[PDB]
Design a protein around this ligand. Sequence first.
Ligand SMILES: CC(=O)SCCNC(=O)CCNC(=O)[C@H](O)C(C)(C)COP(=O)(O)OP(=O)(O)OC[C@H]1O[C@@H](n2cnc3c(N)ncnc32)[C@H](O)[C@@H]1OP(=O)(O)O
Ligand SMILES: CC(=O)SCCNC(=O)CCNC(=O)[C@H](O)C(C)(C)COP(=O)(O)OP(=O)(O)OC[C@H]1O[C@@H](n2cnc3c(N)ncnc32)[C@H](O)[C@@H]1OP(=O)(O)O
Lengths: 153, 153
Amino acid sequence: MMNYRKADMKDISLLVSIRKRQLIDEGIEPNIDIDKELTRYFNNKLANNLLVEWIAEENNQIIATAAIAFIDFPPTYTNKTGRKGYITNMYTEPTSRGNGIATGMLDRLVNEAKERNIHKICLVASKLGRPVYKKYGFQDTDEWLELNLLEHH
Amino acid sequence: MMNYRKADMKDISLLVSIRKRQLIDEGIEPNIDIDKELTRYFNNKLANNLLVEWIAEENNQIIATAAIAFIDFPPTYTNKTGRKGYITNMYTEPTSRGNGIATGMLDRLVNEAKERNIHKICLVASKLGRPVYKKYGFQDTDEWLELNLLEHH
Ligand SMILES: CC(=O)SCCNC(=O)CCNC(=O)[C@H](O)C(C)(C)COP(=O)(O)OP(=O)(O)OC[C@H]1O[C@@H](n2cnc3c(N)ncnc32)[C@H](O)[C@@H]1OP(=O)(O)O
Ligand SMILES: CC(=O)SCCNC(=O)CCNC(=O)[C@H](O)C(C)(C)COP(=O)(O)OP(=O)(O)OC[C@H]1O[C@@H](n2cnc3c(N)ncnc32)[C@H](O)[C@@H]1OP(=O)(O)O
């Protein structure tokens, strides 16, 4: 049956592959090689515990992943530490979708946040992710805006 | 006339006061004391150069502030390093508004980003900030969602 564990340094090449697989599944054009940058990101953030990535395994093949990154923003009255958990790297094997795996992963990620005294979580919703997060209680945020420096000047 | 400089450690108590002033101007309820957390945030992020806060001064009173924080997200094909500049702490003295001060500050912050090989900037728009950022080229982002752990469980 399914087993859940937190990824270790030893798991990095798998996390890297699964992240690429996830992004391509989301429709992104894999135009350039980002292996070096992905591997460095996982190495650094896992080593410093600024990233926690849960995995679901069966027959020691990864069925699903889900991560939370801890990010620092300026304190405000509604979030005195300024810290937030940033949810990312969520992927469930297609034949395993619709069984509540990602939803149960969200529970585990929320727990990582609470254990670190974090009570605000955020994420960027993909097409498939969106109804899952909406169902879970994530809220629309018309306030977030982004500037691409290659596009505007 | 106006002088612009980057804030130093010595400026922290001013940055702290101006941030509170800014948030209250935005309509937030200053319900709890966050001086300790604000001071620690500035101390840490300035010391490590993960925050750059520009100030505009006249007669050595601060007229405006504007900051950019450098935050790490997982690499993707459209942002290979995963890094982003997060714009924050923008405030212009009310009698000085509408003169293009915040807009010129945005130019300086974009420059901080480029000098660090960052080409994606993001922010959370306040009521007064929004038309400024829209005019500047920031784009709506329906993908960002947030969960408040005190509200949903
Ligand atoms: C923040 C980010 O990480 S964004 C990127 C997200 N990942 C991707 O887009 C990669 C490609 N897509 C995927 O890997 C997947 O579709 C994921 C990860 C988004 C979702 O994984 P899943 O394990 O299929 O999620 P989960 O099973 O919890 O929910 C999906 C659906 O099954 C249903 N479901 C799950 N559990 C139950 C249940 N107990 N009773 C009834 N329906 C259920 C959901 O309600 C939902 O269907 P709906 O849209 O009609 O409401
Ligand atoms: C990401 C964050 O930091 S969000 C928080 C932002 N800060 C706050 O909300 C705190 C309270 N509000 C403020 O301090 C201010 O209103 C700020 C910081 C948002 C804006 O500061 P300002 O210096 O007034 O911005 P700026 O002068 O560049 O632009 C504001 C307006 O003056 C006008 N303006 C500026 N320069 C010109 C110009 N050269 N020609 C014509 N109009 C101009 C703008 O077009 C705009 O008016 P509009 O809404 O009709 O388009």
